[PDB]
Design goal:
The structure is cut from a larger assembly and holds two copies of chain A. With 91 residues, chain A is mainly β. The first copy, chain A, has one helix and seven strands; from the N terminus they run βββββββα. Chains A and B meet through loops of A and helix 2 and helix 3 of B. The complex binds a molecule of 2 linked components (NAG-NAG) (2 copies) and 2-acetamido-2-deoxy-beta-D-glucopyranose (NAG). Chain A: It comes from Severe acute respiratory syndrome coronavirus 2 (2019-nCoV).
């Protein structure tokens, strides 16, 4: 531009938000499972793990969460189940 | 132009936004999230896994509180910290 410059910035903005029930960790067999790169959400009856910037729910598995200690120390621990996707191949 | 009672409102709004919605209020709509679950995000950001925070949550909280208290006593003593703000005033008066 005459005696200057102009920048056109292209950026990304979240648009529509929904709002659920959340928990810090899951206790399965006396072990607390923490998410790897996501966050635990609940739609009312079931528990999923979602990426933090886009609602894309998925089934909790052993490949998706990492275990650390027992579930007596954390505050908002909750109760659920983890698939451990090796049973069908075992049979 | 802005009276001293409006800057306080601005800072209060910024504080409420940053303690009730994390950093998401500066890039779009404000999305709420619990504070102990936001400190875990920050810990993961600096390079420490989140399971460190929860298992040491209570202790960490205490530390934070103590630090804040020290500030309240640090500013009253050593009457030279606010000099950067004081000098300005003096300078103007001197000129006049
Ligand atoms: C919360 O999500 C779960 C998981 O999809 C929903 O459960 C499914 O609901 C559909 C619709 O009726 C059924 O066809 C599936 O069989 C259900 N899954 C299971 C494992 O039973 C649940 O309905 C959702 N909650 C609400 C309130 O919609
Ligand atoms: C999650 O599971 C644990 C372990 O089963 C529950 O802790 C037990 O709860 C029962 C009540 O149904 C008590 O009788 C036991 O003494 C508890 N401790 C054990 C079994 O070690 C815990 O309550 C569950 N969390 C829920 C239901 O929110
Ligand atoms: C989140 O849940 C609260 C519970 O009352 C509700 O008032 C609010 O509207 C919800 N947020 C959205 C975006 O629906």
């Amino acid at each position: 531009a005459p005696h200057g410059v102009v920048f056109l910035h292209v950026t990304y903005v979240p648009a529509q938000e929904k709002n659920f029930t959340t928990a810090p960790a899951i206790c399965h067999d006396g072990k607390a499972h923490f998410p790897r790169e996501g966050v635990f959400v609940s739609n009312g009856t079931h528990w999923f793990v979602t990426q933090r910037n886009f609602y894309e729910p998925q089934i909790i598995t052993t490949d998706n969460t990492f275990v650390s200690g027992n579930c007596d120390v954390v505050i908002g621990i909750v109760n659920n189940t983890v698939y451990d996707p090796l049973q069908p191949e075992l049979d | 132009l802005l009276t001293d009672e409006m800057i306080a409102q601005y800072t209060s709004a910024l504080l409420a936004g940053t303690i009730t919605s994390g950093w998401t209020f500066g890039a779009g709509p404000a999305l709420q999230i619990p504070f102990p679950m936001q400190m875990a995000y920050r810990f993961n950001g600096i390079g420490v896994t989140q399971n460190v925070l929860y298992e040491n949550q209570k202790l960490i909280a205490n530390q934070f509180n103590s630090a804040i208290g020290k500030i309240q006593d640090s500013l009253s003593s050593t009457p030279s910290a606010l000099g950067k703000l004081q000098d300005v005033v003096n300078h103007n008066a001197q000129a006049l």
